[PDB]
Motif scaffolding. Sequence first.
Motif, PDB file in Angstrom:
ATOM      1  N   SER A  38       0.099 -10.003   3.588  1.00  0.00           N
ATOM      2  CA  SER A  38       0.504  -8.698   3.036  1.00  0.00           C
ATOM      3  C   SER A  38       0.952  -8.783   1.502  1.00  0.00           C
ATOM      4  O   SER A  38       0.647  -8.079   0.751  1.00  0.00           O
ATOM      5  CB  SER A  38       1.983  -8.318   3.689  1.00  0.00           C
ATOM      6  OG  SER A  38       2.974  -9.342   3.774  1.00  0.00           O
ATOM      7  N   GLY A  39       1.764  -9.993   1.245  1.00  0.00           N
ATOM      8  CA  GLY A  39       2.379 -10.207  -0.346  1.00  0.00           C
ATOM      9  C   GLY A  39       1.111 -10.215  -1.038  1.00  0.00           C
ATOM     10  O   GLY A  39       1.098  -9.426  -2.032  1.00  0.00           O
ATOM     11  N   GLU A  40       0.248 -11.455  -0.968  1.00  0.00           N
ATOM     12  CA  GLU A  40      -0.940 -11.360  -1.748  1.00  0.00           C
ATOM     13  C   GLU A  40      -1.790 -10.222  -1.736  1.00  0.00           C
ATOM     14  O   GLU A  40      -2.329  -9.872  -2.882  1.00  0.00           O
ATOM     15  CB  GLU A  40      -1.799 -12.397  -1.113  1.00  0.00           C
ATOM     16  CG  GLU A  40      -2.863 -13.017  -2.133  1.00  0.00           C
ATOM     17  CD  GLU A  40      -2.156 -13.904  -2.934  1.00  0.00           C
ATOM     18  OE1 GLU A  40      -1.471 -14.763  -2.693  1.00  0.00           O
ATOM     19  OE2 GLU A  40      -2.367 -13.989  -4.336  1.00  0.00           O
ATOM     20  N   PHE A  41      -1.967  -9.419  -0.667  1.00  0.00           N
ATOM     21  CA  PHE A  41      -2.580  -7.976  -0.875  1.00  0.00           C
ATOM     22  C   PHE A  41      -1.827  -6.899  -1.834  1.00  0.00           C
ATOM     23  O   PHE A  41      -2.442  -6.047  -2.780  1.00  0.00           O
ATOM     24  CB  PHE A  41      -2.780  -7.383   0.387  1.00  0.00           C
ATOM     25  CG  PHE A  41      -3.416  -6.097   0.378  1.00  0.00           C
ATOM     26  CD1 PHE A  41      -5.010  -5.900   0.048  1.00  0.00           C
ATOM     27  CD2 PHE A  41      -3.024  -4.646   0.851  1.00  0.00           C
ATOM     28  CE1 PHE A  41      -5.430  -4.804   0.055  1.00  0.00           C
ATOM     29  CE2 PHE A  41      -3.578  -3.565   0.844  1.00  0.00           C
ATOM     30  CZ  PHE A  41      -5.010  -3.602   0.512  1.00  0.00           C
ATOM     31  N   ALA A  42      -0.155  -6.978  -1.918  1.00  0.00           N
ATOM     32  CA  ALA A  42       0.232  -6.136  -2.671  1.00  0.00           C
ATOM     33  C   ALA A  42      -0.038  -6.715  -4.123  1.00  0.00           C
ATOM     34  O   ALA A  42      -0.233  -5.856  -4.889  1.00  0.00           O
ATOM     35  CB  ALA A  42       1.566  -6.118  -2.361  1.00  0.00           C
ATOM     36  N   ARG A  43       0.002  -7.737  -4.289  1.00  0.00           N
ATOM     37  CA  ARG A  43       0.058  -8.416  -5.645  1.00  0.00           C
ATOM     38  C   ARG A  43      -1.417  -8.009  -6.348  1.00  0.00           C
ATOM     39  O   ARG A  43      -1.457  -7.697  -7.460  1.00  0.00           O
ATOM     40  CB  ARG A  43       0.264  -9.577  -5.759  1.00  0.00           C
ATOM     41  CG  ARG A  43      -0.326 -10.572  -6.901  1.00  0.00           C
ATOM     42  CD  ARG A  43       0.734 -11.533  -7.798  1.00  0.00           C
ATOM     43  NE  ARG A  43       0.273 -11.412  -9.039  1.00  0.00           N
ATOM     44  CZ  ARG A  43       0.868 -12.267 -10.000  1.00  0.00           C
ATOM     45  NH1 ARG A  43       1.811 -13.161  -9.549  1.00  0.00           N
ATOM     46  NH2 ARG A  43       0.479 -12.197 -11.302  1.00  0.00           N
ATOM     47  N   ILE A  44      -2.533  -8.186  -5.290  1.00  0.00           N
ATOM     48  CA  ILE A  44      -3.755  -7.883  -6.063  1.00  0.00           C
ATOM     49  C   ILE A  44      -3.830  -6.565  -6.362  1.00  0.00           C
ATOM     50  O   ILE A  44      -4.617  -6.305  -7.560  1.00  0.00           O
ATOM     51  CB  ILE A  44      -4.703  -8.550  -4.878  1.00  0.00           C
ATOM     52  CG1 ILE A  44      -4.681  -9.860  -4.382  1.00  0.00           C
ATOM     53  CG2 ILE A  44      -6.285  -8.091  -5.322  1.00  0.00           C
ATOM     54  CD1 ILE A  44      -5.668 -10.369  -3.766  1.00  0.00           C
ATOM     55  N   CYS A  45      -3.417  -5.558  -5.646  1.00  0.00           N
ATOM     56  CA  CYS A  45      -3.569  -4.333  -6.096  1.00  0.00           C
ATOM     57  C   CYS A  45      -2.675  -3.882  -7.211  1.00  0.00           C
ATOM     58  O   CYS A  45      -3.125  -3.200  -8.082  1.00  0.00           O
ATOM     59  CB  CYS A  45      -3.155  -3.454  -4.842  1.00  0.00           C
ATOM     60  SG  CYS A  45      -4.213  -3.458  -3.573  1.00  0.00           S
ATOM     61  N   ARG A  46      -1.772  -4.413  -7.191  1.00  0.00           N
ATOM     62  CA  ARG A  46      -0.740  -4.302  -8.337  1.00  0.00           C
ATOM     63  C   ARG A  46      -1.346  -4.634  -9.480  1.00  0.00           C
ATOM     64  O   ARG A  46      -1.265  -4.081 -10.746  1.00  0.00           O
ATOM     65  CB  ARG A  46       0.621  -5.118  -8.219  1.00  0.00           C
ATOM     66  CG  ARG A  46       1.773  -4.378  -8.507  1.00  0.00           C
ATOM     67  CD  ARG A  46       2.681  -5.058  -7.505  1.00  0.00           C
ATOM     68  NE  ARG A  46       2.986  -6.391  -7.854  1.00  0.00           N
ATOM     69  CZ  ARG A  46       3.461  -7.226  -6.945  1.00  0.00           C
ATOM     70  NH1 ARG A  46       3.694  -7.062  -5.866  1.00  0.00           N
ATOM     71  NH2 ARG A  46       3.625  -8.689  -7.479  1.00  0.00           N
ATOM     72  N   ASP A  47      -1.969  -5.681  -9.556  1.00  0.00           N
ATOM     73  CA  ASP A  47      -2.623  -6.114 -10.973  1.00  0.00           C
ATOM     74  C   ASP A  47      -3.942  -5.639 -11.194  1.00  0.00           C
ATOM     75  O   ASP A  47      -4.195  -5.098 -12.290  1.00  0.00           O
ATOM     76  CB  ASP A  47      -2.956  -7.757 -10.555  1.00  0.00           C
ATOM     77  CG  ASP A  47      -1.654  -8.779 -10.500  1.00  0.00           C
ATOM     78  OD1 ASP A  47      -0.706  -8.128 -11.157  1.00  0.00           O
ATOM     79  OD2 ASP A  47      -1.703  -9.829 -10.107  1.00  0.00           O
ATOM     80  N   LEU A  48      -4.917  -5.411 -10.125  1.00  0.00           N
ATOM     81  CA  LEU A  48      -6.249  -4.518 -10.590  1.00  0.00           C
ATOM     82  C   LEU A  48      -5.832  -3.245 -10.950  1.00  0.00           C
ATOM     83  O   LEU A  48      -6.191  -2.647 -11.850  1.00  0.00           O
ATOM     84  CB  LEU A  48      -7.179  -4.707  -9.614  1.00  0.00           C
ATOM     85  CG  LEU A  48      -7.529  -5.907  -9.142  1.00  0.00           C
ATOM     86  CD1 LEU A  48      -8.727  -6.130  -8.089  1.00  0.00           C
ATOM     87  CD2 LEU A  48      -7.748  -6.918 -10.565  1.00  0.00           C
ATOM     88  N   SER A  49      -4.508  -2.752 -10.279  1.00  0.00           N
ATOM     89  CA  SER A  49      -3.840  -1.562 -10.926  1.00  0.00           C
ATOM     90  C   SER A  49      -4.140  -1.283 -12.289  1.00  0.00           C
ATOM     91  O   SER A  49      -4.000  -0.276 -12.938  1.00  0.00           O
ATOM     92  CB  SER A  49      -2.564  -1.346 -10.602  1.00  0.00           C
ATOM     93  OG  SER A  49      -2.427  -1.223  -9.090  1.00  0.00           O
TER      94      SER A  49
END
Lengths: 21, 22, 23, 255, 255, 255
Positions: free
Chosen positions: D141-152
């Motif tokens: 979950s954490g990693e998924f949030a981060r990835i989106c946050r960053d490609l955001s």
Amino acid sequence: NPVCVRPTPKWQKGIGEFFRL
Amino acid sequence: NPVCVRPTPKWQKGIGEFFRLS
Amino acid sequence: GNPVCVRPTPKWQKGIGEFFRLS
Amino acid sequence: MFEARLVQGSILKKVLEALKDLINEACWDISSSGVNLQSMDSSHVSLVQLTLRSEGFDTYRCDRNLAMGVNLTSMSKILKCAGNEDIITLRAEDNADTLALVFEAPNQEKVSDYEMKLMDLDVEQLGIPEQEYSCVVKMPSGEFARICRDLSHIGDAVVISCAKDGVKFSASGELGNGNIKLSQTSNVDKEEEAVTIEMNEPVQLTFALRYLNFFTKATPLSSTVTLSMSADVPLVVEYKIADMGHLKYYLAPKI
Amino acid sequence: MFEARLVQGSILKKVLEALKDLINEACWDISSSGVNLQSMDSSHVSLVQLTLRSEGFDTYRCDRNLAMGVNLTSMSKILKCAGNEDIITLRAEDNADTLALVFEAPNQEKVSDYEMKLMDLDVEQLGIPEQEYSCVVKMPSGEFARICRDLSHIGDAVVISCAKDGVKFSASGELGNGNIKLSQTSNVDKEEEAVTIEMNEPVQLTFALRYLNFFTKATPLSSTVTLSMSADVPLVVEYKIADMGHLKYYLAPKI
Amino acid sequence: MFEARLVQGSILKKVLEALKDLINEACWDISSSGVNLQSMDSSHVSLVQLTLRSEGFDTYRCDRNLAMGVNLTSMSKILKCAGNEDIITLRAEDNADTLALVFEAPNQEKVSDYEMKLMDLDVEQLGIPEQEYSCVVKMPSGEFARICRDLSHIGDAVVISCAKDGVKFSASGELGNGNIKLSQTSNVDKEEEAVTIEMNEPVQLTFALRYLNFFTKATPLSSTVTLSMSADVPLVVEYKIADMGHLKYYLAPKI
């Protein structure tokens, strides 16, 4: 939870109405 | 690096278009 | 808890232009 | 009448914070099997399905089926009052417009009671077809949030490209490009750490990052998340609620 | 000269955090017995009284009585530069319309010191009668701080009820209702955690949450707080300072 | 072809954090010697100069001197897509319209590569007089940053006075007046804790705290920092990126 800062109620009476100089 | 709120792309379809109401 | 009051530029501040020359 | 006692009250709070952003007014289906929410977002775009099955509660009693109309922000506000270790009990009358919440401390010293109003609302249901997914990614979950946050930051939409030896996340915008490459590894010892791809075919899909970013607000329910994918078919982002139920999010991909 | 040298600088910081958002300008009455402040707040609603007894400083020298008009905001600003472990001296010169503050670190290699402009201010002083109060609740400061804060989402006033059983904090608004039941904890030693009701009779008064919430800024000064009440008499919310004095706020109920 | 592998990727994020705020954009000039960057702030006041020597990289190949036109925010945005823990490779081909960064984790399970679009810059160099300086102070970086923070509360400008026993930071304005006195330390332990001064002649100089506060954004690059002044000569604030180079900021004093 943080303070949702409320209005001063309309009934509110000042401290100078219970305390004398 | 916080969330950047992207807008909804001109292509986005609604989930309406994939399921049946009701 | 002290933040940084971020300040205005003094009217007296001179730019680094006036102390170093272009290469 | 209905009464549900929940030892890990935290769970209700986490749920709402996840939810309030998506939609302000939702209708809560109480039946003896459990608590159920289903609602589109206020934009009419994604679809969120919440299941809190009755055996997850230390005490569930339901006589009649009920449909409480709840404004989620109020319920969130009331919820915040609840302490983290507090035990939350939900209680409600039948055919009556009010919801009651009780919060009990762990020390057992103090007890709080809030009576939130319900509201008039009718919400359309969609029928979710259960179906078969070419790719299914299980990851932190954490990693998924981060990835989106960053490609955001890079671009509007993320392309998720699923393949046997890992998944790839990518975007394009004014700044440039980015491809994040997560290798499939079944090796690790705690199994929340893993990346896992039950694949029947490779799949490459383009999703709106506006909405994945709304979904990753359920992130602190579960240390793991699951993306189920298929071409021209709503993605299912799913966060398991500790054997009580799921939070699932639906989102259509490009074309 | 007036020279006053307090090991626990933090006290001073904490104190100004408390009053700064309540009083714009205050008169600091220094005498040989110690430092007292008394002022209404800006809106002339609540009243604040401070007492730091001379006994409580590592060094206290007072040549003569003094009446220092200090812009609290600016005094607060200077104390903020002050470090927590810092040994703070307040020094004043007889002629001066100048308050000097001196901070020395446990580091023992850095020494900060500032000066601030005193002003001439008019002191009108309300007499506060000694008293006996119907109920006097002793609870921990944080709990109170939380209670006022949470209820402030619920409505604009709180209600405080005491019996010998415990004390009930209640409110209600467009949202709904809250009742927070603290049951008594006197029997356990509970030096920090305990709740005690020295009730002489029951009480049931209504306070503006807005003002209680300013008062709770004193929380860091003490692990506990005390509410003394009686009908149509104003509330004394009291925060001890450790052997040094106290910070009491006074605030009037409904009718 | 340029390619540099930096084990301590964190160094590259830190530099950006320090600069994004002062410099909108800048030429990164690359030579076999290394990466060196120099530029004036958007308002043409101060001069920042950066130097990462090749020596300091775990891989370095420059073939051809290229000057890369970079939007420091955009580059900050991308570097925040990399873990602290991550190793960071910079690639760039000759006459690139793009610079490519790569981020590899502790496990190498996640690999990220981004492509940041470059720009054209009409910027020509400024020649940097090598000098001997009247006074050179060295002290904790944090302690410097703290001083320029605290005194920013007091007034527009700071006054640095240099003496053999100690160095002394002062300000003033509407609030009042304040002085911070740092005596030089015998130590030896600890170097981080140390203060040390090199007086050829004493200095008393005045500078904007607007800019000093901007410079101390370099604070996490080194646990100590280095002030170099002489009268009527532009100050040098210097942070040493360990075993590589340095980041120096240059600032004009009063008259």
